Amino acid sequence: ELDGDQMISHRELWAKIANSINDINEQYLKVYEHAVSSYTQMYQDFSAVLSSLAGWISPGGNDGNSVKLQVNSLKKALEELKEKYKDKPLYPANNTVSQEQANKWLTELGGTIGKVSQKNGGYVVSINMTPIDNMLKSLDNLGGNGEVVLDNAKYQAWNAGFSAEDETMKNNLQTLVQKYSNANSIFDNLVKVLSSTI
């Protein structure tokens, strides 16, 4: 409990403030920074897939007309994307942490953006790839094979779902970036409050 009569030298106060500033940088700011970096790289890699997609759709179905979607090519790229990020979590940057630590950061980052997973002994907060999994399931449902011809109606429907999952990832990234900006300002304010004590 609070003890107002506790005394401390100015020199010990300076060192205590320094120790705390370092701890907050290590345990909070640097965690957010790496979370942002990791999600940003994933979405960058997904954006490259988006660019590639232009080469995997073309007019088809004997002129009417329809869209010929190279399903296996898209499916392959999305699978490779998931594979790449399987061992690139939001937190922590290296090794593993306890389930309790992982749960704490899941709650901080949001269960939409991260997913707690066990690596065996310890855990990580992985990038939640539900948007990509949803895309894959939808591609599976188009039936057909390595390639499908979609009339206007079926293409509009598929594209609407695909685009929504893309937008979800963009929304997630914008939210993470804002949380990191907020974290930086909370740190600046803490430094300002603590420096004013002396």
Side-chain angles (χ1 to χ4, degrees):
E1 63 191 26
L2 294 183
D3 181 7
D5 284 286
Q6 187 54 273
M7 307 300 293
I8 188 175
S9 71
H10 284 212
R11 184 180 305 106
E12 287 278 38
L13 178 54
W14 302 329
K16 290 259 197 174
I17 290 163
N19 182 64
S20 291
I21 292 179
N22 181 65
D23 280 345
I24 299 158
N25 189 49
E26 293 290 313
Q27 294 186 230
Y28 180 65
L29 286 201
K30 279 174 163 188
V31 174
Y32 260 112
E33 193 286 331
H34 186 86
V36 170
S37 178
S38 294
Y39 206 92
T40 296
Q41 288 172 50
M42 186 276 291
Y43 186 76
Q44 274 180 359
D45 288 347
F46 175 82
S47 289
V49 172
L50 233 46
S51 288
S52 293
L53 182 53
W56 298 332
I57 60 177
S58 56
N62 304 120
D63 290 326
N65 201 19
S66 304
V67 167
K68 180 171 53 179
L69 180 66
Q70 303 179 356
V71 162
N72 282 9
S73 291
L74 183 46
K75 187 170 300 196
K76 188 167 115 67
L78 290 180
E79 281 166 8
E80 289 170 332
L81 173 60
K82 281 188 52 184
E83 178 66 14
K84 183 167 176 190
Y85 286 92
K86 181 185 44 176
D87 293 319
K88 288 177 74 185
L90 290 172
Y91 166 77
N94 306 117
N95 310 311
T96 57
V97 297
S98 81
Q99 181 184 43
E100 295 302 320
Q101 198 51 26
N103 291 329
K104 176 190 170 185
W105 273 105
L106 181 69
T107 299
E108 175 68 16
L109 304 175
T112 292
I113 310 174
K115 180 169 289 172
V116 175
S117 53
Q118 176 168 20
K119 283 328 239 190
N120 207 10
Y123 298 76
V124 305
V125 177
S126 290
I127 297 169
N128 186 337
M129 292 298 267
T130 298
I132 304 301
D133 293 325
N134 284 352
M135 288 169 186
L136 284 167
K137 189 178 321 149
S138 168
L139 286 171
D140 189 20
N141 288 345
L142 295 178
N145 206 320
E147 164 180 310
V148 180
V149 177
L150 304 165
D151 61 27
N152 296 343
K154 296 183 189 300
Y155 179 76
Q156 168 183 93
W158 167 75
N159 176 66
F162 182 81
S163 297
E165 301 296 340
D166 177 30
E167 183 65 13
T168 293
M169 283 187 291
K170 286 191 259 177
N171 288 346
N172 290 344
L173 179 51
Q174 168 189 307
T175 295
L176 196 47
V177 166
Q178 184 68 65
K179 284 172 148 293
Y180 179 37
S181 178
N182 288 358
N184 281 331
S185 288
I186 296 158
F187 177 90
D188 292 352
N189 277 289
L190 195 75
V191 165
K192 183 178 179 180
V193 169
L194 290 180
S195 58
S196 90
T197 68
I198 72 101

Short mmCIF file of all heavy atoms in Angstrom, two decimals, residues 30-40 42 85 87-93 105-106 109-110 112-115 124-128 176:
data_model
loop_
_atom_site.label_atom_id
_atom_site.label_comp_id
_atom_site.label_asym_id
_atom_site.label_seq_id
_atom_site.Cartn_x
_atom_site.Cartn_y
_atom_site.Cartn_z
N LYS A 30 8.73 -2.12 -28.17
CA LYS A 30 9.38 -3.03 -29.12
C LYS A 30 8.49 -4.23 -29.51
O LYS A 30 8.61 -4.74 -30.63
CB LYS A 30 10.72 -3.52 -28.56
CG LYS A 30 11.86 -2.53 -28.75
CD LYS A 30 13.11 -3.04 -28.03
CE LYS A 30 14.38 -2.34 -28.50
NZ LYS A 30 15.61 -2.98 -27.92
N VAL A 31 7.61 -4.66 -28.61
CA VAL A 31 6.64 -5.71 -28.94
C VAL A 31 5.67 -5.24 -30.03
O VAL A 31 5.49 -5.91 -31.04
CB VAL A 31 5.85 -6.18 -27.71
CG1 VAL A 31 4.75 -7.17 -28.13
CG2 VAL A 31 6.81 -6.81 -26.69
N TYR A 32 5.04 -4.08 -29.81
CA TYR A 32 4.19 -3.46 -30.83
C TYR A 32 4.90 -3.25 -32.17
O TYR A 32 4.34 -3.54 -33.24
CB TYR A 32 3.64 -2.12 -30.36
CG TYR A 32 2.23 -2.20 -29.86
CD1 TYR A 32 1.94 -2.00 -28.51
CD2 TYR A 32 1.17 -2.47 -30.73
CE1 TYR A 32 0.64 -2.06 -28.04
CE2 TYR A 32 -0.12 -2.54 -30.27
CZ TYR A 32 -0.39 -2.34 -28.92
OH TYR A 32 -1.69 -2.40 -28.47
N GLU A 33 6.13 -2.73 -32.11
CA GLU A 33 6.87 -2.46 -33.34
C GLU A 33 7.00 -3.71 -34.18
O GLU A 33 6.79 -3.68 -35.41
CB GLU A 33 8.26 -1.88 -33.03
CG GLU A 33 8.97 -1.29 -34.26
CD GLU A 33 9.51 -2.33 -35.22
OE1 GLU A 33 9.84 -3.45 -34.77
OE2 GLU A 33 9.60 -2.04 -36.43
N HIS A 34 7.35 -4.82 -33.54
CA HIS A 34 7.52 -6.08 -34.26
C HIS A 34 6.18 -6.66 -34.74
O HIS A 34 6.10 -7.22 -35.84
CB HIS A 34 8.29 -7.12 -33.43
CG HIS A 34 8.60 -8.38 -34.20
ND1 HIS A 34 9.72 -8.50 -34.98
CD2 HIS A 34 7.91 -9.53 -34.32
CE1 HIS A 34 9.72 -9.69 -35.55
NE2 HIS A 34 8.64 -10.34 -35.17
N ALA A 35 5.13 -6.50 -33.94
CA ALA A 35 3.78 -6.87 -34.40
C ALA A 35 3.40 -6.15 -35.69
O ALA A 35 2.97 -6.77 -36.67
CB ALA A 35 2.73 -6.58 -33.29
N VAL A 36 3.55 -4.82 -35.69
CA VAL A 36 3.29 -4.03 -36.88
C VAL A 36 4.14 -4.49 -38.07
O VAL A 36 3.61 -4.69 -39.16
CB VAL A 36 3.55 -2.53 -36.63
CG1 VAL A 36 3.51 -1.76 -37.97
CG2 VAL A 36 2.50 -1.98 -35.65
N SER A 37 5.44 -4.66 -37.84
CA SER A 37 6.34 -5.10 -38.91
C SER A 37 5.90 -6.43 -39.51
O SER A 37 5.82 -6.59 -40.75
CB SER A 37 7.78 -5.20 -38.35
OG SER A 37 8.68 -5.68 -39.34
N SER A 38 5.60 -7.40 -38.65
CA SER A 38 5.17 -8.72 -39.10
C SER A 38 3.87 -8.70 -39.90
O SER A 38 3.78 -9.31 -40.97
CB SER A 38 5.03 -9.67 -37.91
OG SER A 38 6.30 -9.91 -37.32
N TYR A 39 2.85 -7.99 -39.40
CA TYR A 39 1.59 -7.95 -40.16
C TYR A 39 1.75 -7.19 -41.48
O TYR A 39 1.16 -7.56 -42.51
CB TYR A 39 0.46 -7.34 -39.32
CG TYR A 39 -0.93 -7.81 -39.77
CD1 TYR A 39 -1.52 -8.92 -39.18
CD2 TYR A 39 -1.62 -7.17 -40.80
CE1 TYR A 39 -2.78 -9.38 -39.59
CE2 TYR A 39 -2.88 -7.60 -41.21
CZ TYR A 39 -3.45 -8.71 -40.61
OH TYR A 39 -4.69 -9.15 -41.00
N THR A 40 2.58 -6.15 -41.45
CA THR A 40 2.88 -5.36 -42.64
C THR A 40 3.54 -6.21 -43.73
O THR A 40 3.15 -6.15 -44.89
CB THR A 40 3.78 -4.16 -42.30
OG1 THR A 40 3.08 -3.28 -41.40
CG2 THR A 40 4.16 -3.39 -43.57
N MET A 42 3.33 -9.52 -44.03
CA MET A 42 2.33 -10.45 -44.54
C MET A 42 1.43 -9.77 -45.56
O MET A 42 1.15 -10.34 -46.62
CB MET A 42 1.50 -11.04 -43.40
CG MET A 42 0.54 -12.13 -43.82
SD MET A 42 -1.03 -11.52 -44.48
CE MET A 42 -1.75 -10.84 -42.97
N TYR A 85 4.31 -17.70 -43.21
CA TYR A 85 4.06 -16.99 -41.94
C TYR A 85 3.76 -17.90 -40.74
O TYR A 85 3.54 -17.42 -39.64
CB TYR A 85 3.01 -15.89 -42.14
CG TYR A 85 3.65 -14.74 -42.88
CD1 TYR A 85 3.60 -14.66 -44.27
CD2 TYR A 85 4.40 -13.80 -42.20
CE1 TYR A 85 4.24 -13.64 -44.94
CE2 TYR A 85 5.03 -12.79 -42.85
CZ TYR A 85 4.96 -12.70 -44.21
OH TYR A 85 5.61 -11.67 -44.84
N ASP A 87 5.75 -19.66 -39.09
CA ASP A 87 6.78 -19.50 -38.07
C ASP A 87 7.24 -18.04 -37.93
O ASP A 87 8.36 -17.77 -37.52
CB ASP A 87 7.98 -20.40 -38.36
CG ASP A 87 7.64 -21.89 -38.23
OD1 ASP A 87 6.91 -22.26 -37.29
OD2 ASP A 87 8.11 -22.68 -39.09
N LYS A 88 6.35 -17.10 -38.28
CA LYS A 88 6.65 -15.68 -38.14
C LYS A 88 5.53 -15.02 -37.35
O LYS A 88 4.62 -14.41 -37.93
CB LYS A 88 6.79 -15.01 -39.51
CG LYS A 88 8.06 -15.37 -40.27
CD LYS A 88 8.09 -14.73 -41.66
CE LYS A 88 8.37 -13.23 -41.60
NZ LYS A 88 8.28 -12.57 -42.95
N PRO A 89 5.56 -15.16 -36.01
CA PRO A 89 4.44 -14.68 -35.19
C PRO A 89 4.42 -13.17 -35.02
O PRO A 89 5.40 -12.49 -35.35
CB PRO A 89 4.69 -15.35 -33.84
CG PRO A 89 6.17 -15.48 -33.77
CD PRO A 89 6.64 -15.75 -35.19
N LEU A 90 3.32 -12.64 -34.50
CA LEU A 90 3.27 -11.22 -34.15
C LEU A 90 4.16 -10.98 -32.93
O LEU A 90 4.78 -9.92 -32.80
CB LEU A 90 1.84 -10.80 -33.80
CG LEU A 90 0.83 -10.76 -34.95
CD1 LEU A 90 -0.58 -10.51 -34.41
CD2 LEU A 90 1.26 -9.67 -35.93
N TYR A 91 4.19 -11.97 -32.05
CA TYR A 91 4.87 -11.87 -30.75
C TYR A 91 5.12 -13.28 -30.23
O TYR A 91 4.22 -14.12 -30.30
CB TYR A 91 3.99 -11.10 -29.76
CG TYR A 91 4.43 -11.22 -28.30
CD1 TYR A 91 5.52 -10.49 -27.82
CD2 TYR A 91 3.76 -12.05 -27.41
CE1 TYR A 91 5.93 -10.58 -26.48
CE2 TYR A 91 4.17 -12.15 -26.04
CZ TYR A 91 5.25 -11.41 -25.60
OH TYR A 91 5.67 -11.50 -24.27
N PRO A 92 6.33 -13.56 -29.72
CA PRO A 92 7.47 -12.63 -29.65
C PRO A 92 8.35 -12.78 -30.89
O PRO A 92 8.20 -13.74 -31.64
CB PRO A 92 8.22 -13.13 -28.40
CG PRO A 92 8.02 -14.62 -28.44
CD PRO A 92 6.64 -14.85 -29.09
N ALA A 93 9.27 -11.84 -31.09
CA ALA A 93 10.16 -11.89 -32.25
C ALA A 93 11.06 -13.13 -32.27
O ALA A 93 11.40 -13.63 -33.34
CB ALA A 93 11.02 -10.62 -32.32
N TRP A 105 -0.87 -10.82 -24.42
CA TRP A 105 -0.67 -10.08 -25.66
C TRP A 105 -1.77 -10.33 -26.69
O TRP A 105 -2.05 -9.47 -27.51
CB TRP A 105 0.73 -10.30 -26.22
CG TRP A 105 1.69 -9.31 -25.62
CD1 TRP A 105 2.64 -9.54 -24.67
CD2 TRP A 105 1.76 -7.91 -25.93
NE1 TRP A 105 3.31 -8.38 -24.37
CE2 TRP A 105 2.79 -7.36 -25.13
CE3 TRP A 105 1.06 -7.07 -26.80
CZ2 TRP A 105 3.13 -6.01 -25.19
CZ3 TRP A 105 1.40 -5.74 -26.86
CH2 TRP A 105 2.43 -5.21 -26.05
N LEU A 106 -2.40 -11.50 -26.65
CA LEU A 106 -3.55 -11.75 -27.54
C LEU A 106 -4.62 -10.71 -27.23
O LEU A 106 -5.15 -10.06 -28.12
CB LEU A 106 -4.11 -13.15 -27.33
CG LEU A 106 -5.29 -13.42 -28.27
CD1 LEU A 106 -4.79 -13.51 -29.71
CD2 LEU A 106 -6.04 -14.67 -27.88
N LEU A 109 -3.53 -7.19 -28.48
CA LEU A 109 -3.59 -7.02 -29.94
C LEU A 109 -4.96 -7.30 -30.58
O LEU A 109 -5.28 -6.77 -31.65
CB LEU A 109 -2.55 -7.92 -30.61
CG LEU A 109 -1.11 -7.71 -30.14
CD1 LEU A 109 -0.21 -8.74 -30.79
CD2 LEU A 109 -0.65 -6.30 -30.45
N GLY A 110 -5.75 -8.17 -29.95
CA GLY A 110 -7.06 -8.53 -30.49
C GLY A 110 -7.09 -9.92 -31.09
O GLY A 110 -6.18 -10.31 -31.83
N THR A 112 -8.85 -11.09 -33.37
CA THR A 112 -9.09 -11.10 -34.80
C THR A 112 -7.75 -11.10 -35.52
O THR A 112 -7.61 -11.72 -36.58
CB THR A 112 -9.89 -9.86 -35.25
OG1 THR A 112 -11.22 -9.93 -34.74
CG2 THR A 112 -9.95 -9.77 -36.77
N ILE A 113 -6.76 -10.42 -34.94
CA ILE A 113 -5.50 -10.21 -35.63
C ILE A 113 -4.45 -11.27 -35.27
O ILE A 113 -3.63 -11.67 -36.11
CB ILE A 113 -4.97 -8.77 -35.41
CG1 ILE A 113 -6.10 -7.76 -35.72
CG2 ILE A 113 -3.78 -8.50 -36.31
CD1 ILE A 113 -5.78 -6.27 -35.42
N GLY A 114 -4.49 -11.74 -34.03
CA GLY A 114 -3.56 -12.77 -33.57
C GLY A 114 -4.26 -14.05 -33.15
O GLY A 114 -5.48 -14.09 -32.99
N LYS A 115 -3.47 -15.10 -32.98
CA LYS A 115 -4.01 -16.38 -32.54
C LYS A 115 -2.96 -17.09 -31.70
O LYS A 115 -1.84 -17.33 -32.16
CB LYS A 115 -4.39 -17.26 -33.74
CG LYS A 115 -4.95 -18.64 -33.38
CD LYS A 115 -5.56 -19.34 -34.60
CE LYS A 115 -6.87 -18.65 -35.05
NZ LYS A 115 -7.43 -19.14 -36.36
N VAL A 124 3.29 -18.82 -28.85
CA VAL A 124 3.46 -17.55 -29.54
C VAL A 124 2.09 -16.97 -29.85
O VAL A 124 1.08 -17.65 -29.71
CB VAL A 124 4.25 -17.70 -30.85
CG1 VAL A 124 5.58 -18.37 -30.62
CG2 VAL A 124 3.42 -18.48 -31.90
N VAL A 125 2.06 -15.70 -30.23
CA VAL A 125 0.83 -15.13 -30.75
C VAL A 125 1.03 -15.04 -32.26
O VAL A 125 1.72 -14.14 -32.74
CB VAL A 125 0.53 -13.72 -30.19
CG1 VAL A 125 -0.73 -13.16 -30.85
CG2 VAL A 125 0.38 -13.75 -28.68
N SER A 126 0.44 -15.98 -32.99
CA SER A 126 0.61 -16.06 -34.43
C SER A 126 -0.25 -15.02 -35.13
O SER A 126 -1.19 -14.48 -34.56
CB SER A 126 0.25 -17.46 -34.94
OG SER A 126 1.20 -18.43 -34.53
N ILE A 127 0.08 -14.73 -36.38
CA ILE A 127 -0.83 -13.94 -37.21
C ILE A 127 -2.06 -14.79 -37.49
O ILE A 127 -1.93 -15.92 -37.97
CB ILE A 127 -0.19 -13.56 -38.55
CG1 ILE A 127 1.05 -12.67 -38.32
CG2 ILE A 127 -1.22 -12.85 -39.45
CD1 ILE A 127 1.90 -12.46 -39.56
N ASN A 128 -3.24 -14.26 -37.19
CA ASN A 128 -4.49 -14.98 -37.46
C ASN A 128 -4.80 -14.94 -38.96
O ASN A 128 -5.10 -13.88 -39.52
CB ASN A 128 -5.63 -14.38 -36.64
CG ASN A 128 -6.94 -15.17 -36.76
OD1 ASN A 128 -7.16 -15.91 -37.72
ND2 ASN A 128 -7.81 -14.99 -35.78
N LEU A 176 -3.81 -2.03 -36.01
CA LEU A 176 -2.52 -2.30 -35.38
C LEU A 176 -1.58 -1.08 -35.43
O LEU A 176 -0.90 -0.75 -34.45
CB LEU A 176 -1.87 -3.50 -36.07
CG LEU A 176 -0.71 -4.24 -35.45
CD1 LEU A 176 -1.00 -4.55 -33.95
CD2 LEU A 176 -0.46 -5.53 -36.23
#
